[PDB]
Design a protein around this nucleic acid. Structure first.
Lengths: 153, 168, 248, 50, 54, 260, 133
RNA sequence: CCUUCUCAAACAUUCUGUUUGGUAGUGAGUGAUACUCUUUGGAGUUAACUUGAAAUUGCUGGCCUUUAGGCGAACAAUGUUCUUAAA
């Protein structure tokens, strides 16, 4: 989870302040005009809207999905492990939607999809996928089927 | 005096910093009225290489946009040679209160036609120029407390000095 | 404590880099000093001067005794400091960081500067800066009245000074400033005499505001300090008149 | 394969249009001077500090 | 309905970069980053030519 | 010197050798190997007692890179030109600035890469080896040249095309585009690379027989060989195809007396 | 059943037996530690072997490291079965070159040159396409 | 959880030329044609290919120094010991 956060902090989305700042820069450029060039590769960032996260699945586009364990309407979330299971998407259940919101400039996020990666980071991506599929899909798959809890307090 | 002081652990800075900031802003605007009232520019410019010689009041150049007798322009047209031995700071400021010049060899080794007087406190004086007057610095401390000239035989090294009791 | 798995690797890699650049420095300087310049990069040495992307001007080295003031920097990220550089910093008393000292620059002095370059910062000092350092900081280890005597005293008594420096006839710590600036008769007397220097950390740190200062200063230090590891590394010099405005 | 045979939109491949409309909004505001350029703003602050 | 100055200048850049042909300017990356439609290019260029430059 | 006639004899012998003949659609790499000339030099102590990844650029009368490129258009692997430049260098130099200079003499830089790009984009052995294996011509600034071998990988220093070539944009304090402009011309068409391994064996790669004229091969070989004789004390010279056995042309028997 | 001897694959660069000892001592005391190295240059072959005082401590150490991401690529550790022993590893250094003199004098090997040249000419006959030299 | 030698000199003015020096590697595996000695111990060189930094034990070069270091540096040499990246 630590290296996953080190990954996703490389792919923080742009804040509203940074967005508006770049907008003012390019707008002052065109205001002088001083139309510098027409070139920008793409923005790459994490994807965090829940319907947008589900939307990036069923294409498939999600290379990694982080799923928060704690959501108070849990039923918003419960299909996502089975859905990434059947779609073959490398999902991982992360601990705490606040830590998702921190990496995406929200209060909470509860989902975290990531699709587009630079070539500098693509090799780290694949080994992280293999790491998760070793650590999550192998360890917890059979005990996922078992009825948890039931022991009194 | 500009000496490294052992810091006291007993004090708390949290009060003296408030006094500091209050006095800083207050003296700041009072320096504004004293610089504008004296008719010159409130930001004082300094040559950087003059500051590299010495970090003092003499670093600042003071722009444009009589003296009260006798203490102002006491020792008029008067050229000093303060040594490297003497404390440069308060003697420098006293000569600037006189209007005379300051020549220290301590400033010189960073890198003497009109010099008549050495302020020095040393037992053995090397070059012993009879043209140049050899004086222990209390002469400046006593002349300005009197406002007037006194003989320098007591202030000649290594003659003993009158126990100075200031006018208070 | 269970330390970690990663720090032990990163320290090993960083010590590998440092031992490699130090061996390169040692071999290249041995070929220079033995004067067997056959197949090396360059014969003569260079000096960087960072002033205000900011302007970085180089000079050739002049074989002239130059007064330098050295300032110990916290070394790079996870590095065990090697025993060769540990020896030099032990001689120059630069352990317990934020600790400078005044030094003489000659051509016998110069090769160690390429060695300990990733741990200190160098430049040309000014008389006002030297003056401020000595009039505001400095303690002398001292044999006193009746002591167990690991005993250090701040610079107040010029008569304590001319006591132990009467043989060279050195009085009045202003003259110690003057002869460190001068180095005409004896610098090294004053150099062994003023033996410890201590500088405060520039930012107090722990607390909400000062972490911003720490991050901005780490970014500034990343812009300023450059780590060549080439063994023909130009000696980086910075404005100690700018630096002591921060640290003193 | 995915579920839906939804055709890919044009705007996923080209630089974002709505960004550019917001850009031209700011351009029209600066042409009217309602927004000061940030270099001019730093120029203002550097004089106003003194 | 006239044309805007930036985009007619953009068309003017395309008119000098490729000339008149459309299959080359359609597969141009620089100055066709919105990847305009084959014939929208024709329509805007014909409007620009009728406006300016025959 | 060296009897040019004997070299024409040997190259006509090799033309006759390569003229000797369920099959593949796409032809064997080994079939492409058995058509190519390699110069082999026996010489006393070709070590500098140290590894030499620096390539010597020998002045050659003819330029095989143009028939390389013309057959490479037909070939599967396409001839590509890589330059590796400084960060400020790439900030200043643009691509049309290169392309306008190179269309004058009719060549082309494929790509230009910063050391930053080597150390973050291709900081992965698979992607780096795949990126290097695309290229035939690899150029690098002489300042960067001695910083390369941690970034390049030793798999790049194994082969002759994959190892980079020293080239200089500077002539004064700063670089000039004129210097890089004519310097890529010098390195392109007037110079040939030389690996400098250890031992007594030197292998020099010349190229496929189908690319050049055989007397032009002979002229280039004799020029290079005289350059080598004036350079180094040489035991012998065997030139051959790497499928073929050797061909003794020239040797100096007294070099071995002069070693000890 | 499993022994205390341990196989570790996929080691990072510069990560050696000293660091293996210094790290895996925190699991418990270890019996032996070795790294597969290359012969000409003493570089890691990225796999090695551990031995502990206990098999149970070996299994505990193997559990918390089997899918462990570390310094780039992940690591994989497997304990060995009870029938397993350590064999044949050595810390190889960089083997520098040696130069030894030629034993034969210069005129014997001049004769050897003259013989080998004629012999290669006979091979160019024997292969064989014509070569008058 | 770190980041990799990102230039030196000489000559020359040609609006920049000419010469010289400066580079230890990712491990494993395939494999052409050979070359050189060594005194059989092989050693050092030579095309070409593969591979998600992959991964299972190739048994103990030599010489020199000190109690580990150099052979790409011989009165050559080296250690894991920097705290406001804390708690």
């Amino acid at each position: 989870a630590a290296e996953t956060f080190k990954l996703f902090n490389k792919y923080r989305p742009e804040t509203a302040a940074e967005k508006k700042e770049r907008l003012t820069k390019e707008a002052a450029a065109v205001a002088e005009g001083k139309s510098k060039q027409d070139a920008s590769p793409k923005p790459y960032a994490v994807k965090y809207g829940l319907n947008h996260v589900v939307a990036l699945i069923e294409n498939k586009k999600a290379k990694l999905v982080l799923i928060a364990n704690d959501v108070d309407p849990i039923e918003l979330v419960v299909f996502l492990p089975a859905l990434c299971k059947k779609m073959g998407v490398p999902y991982a259940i992360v601990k705490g939607k606040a830590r998702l919101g921190t990496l995406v400039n929200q209060k909470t996020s509860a989902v975290a999809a990531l699709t587009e990666v630079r070539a500098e980071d693509e090799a780290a991506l694949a080994k992280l996928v293999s790491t998760i599929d070793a650590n999550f899909a192998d360890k917890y798959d059979e005990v996922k089927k078992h009825w948890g809890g039931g022991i009194l307090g | 005096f500009k000496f490294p002081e052992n810091i006291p652990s007993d004090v708390d800075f949290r009060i003296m910093l408030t006094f500091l900031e209050f006095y800083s802003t207050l003296l700041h605007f009072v320096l504004y009225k004293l610089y504008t009232d004296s008719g010159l520019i409130y930001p004082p410019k300094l040559d950087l290489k003059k500051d590299k010689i010495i970090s003092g009041l003499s670093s600042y150049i003071l722009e444009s946009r009589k003296y009260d007798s006798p203490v102002a322009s006491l020792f008029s047209a008067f050229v000093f040679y303060v040594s490297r031995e003497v404390p440069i700071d308060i003697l420098e400021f006293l000569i600037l209160s006189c209007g005379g010049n300051v020549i220290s060899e301590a400033a010189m080794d960073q890198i003497m036609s009109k010099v008549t007087h050495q302020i020095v406190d040393r037992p053995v004086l090397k070059n012993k120029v009879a043209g140049r007057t050899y004086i222990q610095p209390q002469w400046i401390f006593d002349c300005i407390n009197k406002g007037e000239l006194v003989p320098a035989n007591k202030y000649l090294p290594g003659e003993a000095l009158p126990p100075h009791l200031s006018p208070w | 404590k269970f330390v970690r798995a990663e720090s032990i690797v990163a320290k090993t890699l960083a010590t590998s880099r440092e031992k490699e650049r130090i061996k390169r420095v040692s071999i290249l300087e041995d070929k220079k000093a033995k004067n067997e310049t056959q197949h090396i990069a360059s014969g003569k040495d260079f000096i960087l001067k960072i002033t205000e992307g900011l302007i970085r001007e180089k000079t050739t080295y002049d074989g002239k005794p130059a007064l330098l003031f050295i300032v110990r920097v916290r070394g790079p990220l996870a590095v065990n400091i090697p025993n060769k550089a540990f020896k030099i910093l032990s001689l120059l008393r630069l352990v317990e960081t934020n600790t400078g000292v005044f030094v003489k620059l000659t051509k016998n002095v110069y090769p160690l500067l390429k060695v300990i370059a990733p741990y200190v910062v160098i430049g040309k000092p000014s008389l006002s800066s030297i003056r401020s350092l000595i009039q505001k900081r400095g303690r002398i280890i001292y044999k006193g009245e009746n002591e167990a005597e690991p005993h250090e005293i701040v610079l107040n008594d010029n008569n304590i000074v001319e006591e132990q420096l009467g043989d060279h006839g050195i009085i009045c710590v202003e003259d110690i400033i003057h002869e460190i600036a001068t180095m005409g008769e004896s610098f090294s007397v004053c150099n062994f005499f003023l033996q410890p220097f201590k500088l405060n950390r520039e930012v107090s740190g722990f607390g909400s505001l000062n972490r911003l200062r720490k991050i901005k200063q780490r970014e500034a230090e990343s812009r300023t300090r450059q780590f060549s590891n080439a063994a023909t590394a130009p000696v980086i010099e910075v404005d100690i008149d700018s630096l002591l405005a921060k640290l003193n | 394969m995915p579920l839906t045979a939804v055709p890919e939109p044009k705007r996923r491949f080209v630089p974002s249009k709505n960004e550019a409309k917001r850009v031209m909004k700011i351009v029209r505001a600066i042409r009217e001077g309602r927004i000061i350029p940030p270099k001019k703003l730093k120029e203002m602050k550097x004089x106003x500090x003194x | 309905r006239s044309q805007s100055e930036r985009e007619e200048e953009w068309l003017e850049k395309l008119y000098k970069k490729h000339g008149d042909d459309y299959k080359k300017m359609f597969f141009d990356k620089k100055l066709n980053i919105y990847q305009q439609s084959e014939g929208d290019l024709k329509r805007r260029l014909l409007r620009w030519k009728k406006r300016n430059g025959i | 010197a060296i009897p040019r006639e004997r070299v024409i004899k040997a190259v006509n012998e090799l033309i006759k050798f390569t003229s000797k003949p369920k099959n593949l659609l796409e032809d064997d790499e080994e079939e492409l190997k058995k058509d190519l000339q390699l110069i082999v030099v026996n010489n006393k102590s070709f070590t500098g007692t140290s590894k030499s990844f620096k390539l010597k650029l020998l002045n050659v009368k003819h330029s095989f890179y143009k028939p390389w490129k013309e057959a490479s258009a037909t070939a599967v692997k396409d001839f590509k030109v890589l330059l590796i430049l400084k960060d400020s260098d790439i900030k200043k130099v643009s691509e049309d600035d290169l392309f306008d200079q190179l269309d004058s003499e009719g060549i082309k830089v494929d790509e230009i890469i910063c050391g930053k790009d080597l150390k973050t984009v291709y900081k992965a052995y698979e992607a780096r080896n795949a990126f290097i294996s695309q290229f035939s011509l690899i150029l690098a600034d002489d300042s960067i040249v001695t910083s390369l071998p941690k970034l390049m990988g030793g798999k790049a220093y194994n082969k002759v095309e994959t190892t980079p070539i020293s080239i200089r944009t500077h002539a004064n304090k700063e670089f000039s585009l004129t210097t890089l402009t004519n310097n890529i011309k010098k390195v392109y068409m007037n110079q040939l690379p030389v690996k400098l391994p250890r031992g007594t064996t030197l292998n020099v790669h010349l190229g496929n027989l189908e690319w050049l004229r055989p007397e032009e091969f002979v002229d280039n070989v004799e020029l290079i060989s005289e350059q080598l004789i004036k350079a180094y004390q040489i035991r012998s010279i065997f030139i051959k195809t790497n499928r073929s056995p050797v061909l003794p042309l020239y040797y100096n028997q007294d070099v071995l007396d002069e070693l000890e | 059943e499993y022994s205390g001897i341990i196989y570790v694959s996929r080691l990072p660069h510069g990560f050696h037996e000293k660091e293996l000892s210094k790290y895996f001592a925190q699991f418990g005391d270890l019996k032996e530690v070795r790294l597969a190295r290359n012969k000409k240059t003493g570089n890691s072959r990225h796999y090695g072997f551990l031995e502990f005082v206990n098999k149970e401590d070996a299994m505990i150490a193997q559990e918390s490291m089997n899918n462990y991401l570390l310094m780039g690529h992940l690591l994989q550790v497997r304990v060995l079965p009870k029938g397993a022993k350590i064999e044949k590893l050595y810390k190889y250094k960089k083997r520098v070159l040696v130069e030894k003199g030629i034993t034969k004098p210069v005129k014997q090997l001049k004769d050897n040159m003259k013989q080998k040249h004629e012999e290669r000419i006979k091979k160019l006959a024997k292969s064989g396409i014509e070569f008058k030299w």
